[PDB]
Amino acid sequence: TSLIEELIRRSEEQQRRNEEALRQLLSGIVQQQNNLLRAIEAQQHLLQLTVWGIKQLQARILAVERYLRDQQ
Amino acid sequence: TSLIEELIRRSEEQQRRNEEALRQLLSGIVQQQNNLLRAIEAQQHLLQLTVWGIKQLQARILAVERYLRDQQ
Amino acid sequence: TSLIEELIRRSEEQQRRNEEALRQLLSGIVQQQNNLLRAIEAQQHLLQLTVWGIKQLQARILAVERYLRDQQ
């Protein structure tokens, strides 16, 4: 999803800030960990959708396989 | 999986603790990075299973497509 | 992918270093957050490929379902 891409871009922005600050940092590290957690949660949501999409495709292919067996 | 949801909830708990501590913190940030890494590893395991599930569906649909071609 | 496994192993290495340093640490935490972000980005790439793989399987099964309907 574009949100995962948006959360990643925000993590990239915060990462550059934390590295530059390395060269207030602790707050940035904590915020960055929240940025990463949000990304992981968004990826989890899409991953869960693909899991259900795979099971629906499994059901559709099984119905076709059974139709072809039944036609014999 | 429910484990990924459990690892995420633990990361959410540790995140609230680190933010509240921001308002011992370093240990919490290190632990939180382990919580995130465990989540990423669990997501990787489920992602790998979906990759193999997709290839098995590909093989099943290909077998049906070939059966239908062969019947002609 | 093996890259995600390589990024994870690097995060595991950096995590052990940060925990041992807990027992220079800030640089290690920042680097570890970059290791995690890279993992999340790599997982996002594979996740996006599975999403497109699922839609192509959907199109293939739909074509078979339509062929079978049309043959009647």
The C-alpha of C36 sits at a distance from chain A's nearest C-alpha, in angstroms, of 8
Q: Return d(Cα C47, Cα A39) in angstroms, integer.
A: 13
Query: What does R_g of chain C's alpha carbons equal in angstroms?
Result: 22
- Domain CATH for B60: 1.10.287.210
Nearest to C35 by CA among B36, B26, B13, B11: B36
Q: Return d(Cα C44, Cα A2) in angstroms, integer.
A: 11
Q: Return d(Cα A42, Cα A47) in angstroms, integer.
A: 9
Q: What is the DSSP string of A11-70?
A: HHHHHHHHHHHH--HHHHHHHHHHHHHHHHHHHHHHHHHHHHHHHHHHHHHHHHHHHHHH
Number of domains in chain C: 1
Of C25, C40, C46, the CB nearest to B40: C40
Q: Return d(Cα C66, Cα A30) in angstroms, integer.
A: 53
Domain that holds residue B37: 2-71
Q: How far is CA C5 from CA A42, A56, C23, C60, C65, in A?
A: 20, 29, 27, 31, 38
Rounded to an integer, what is the distance from CA C22 to the centroid of its chain?
29
CB contact under 8 Å between C36 and B40, yes or no, is yes
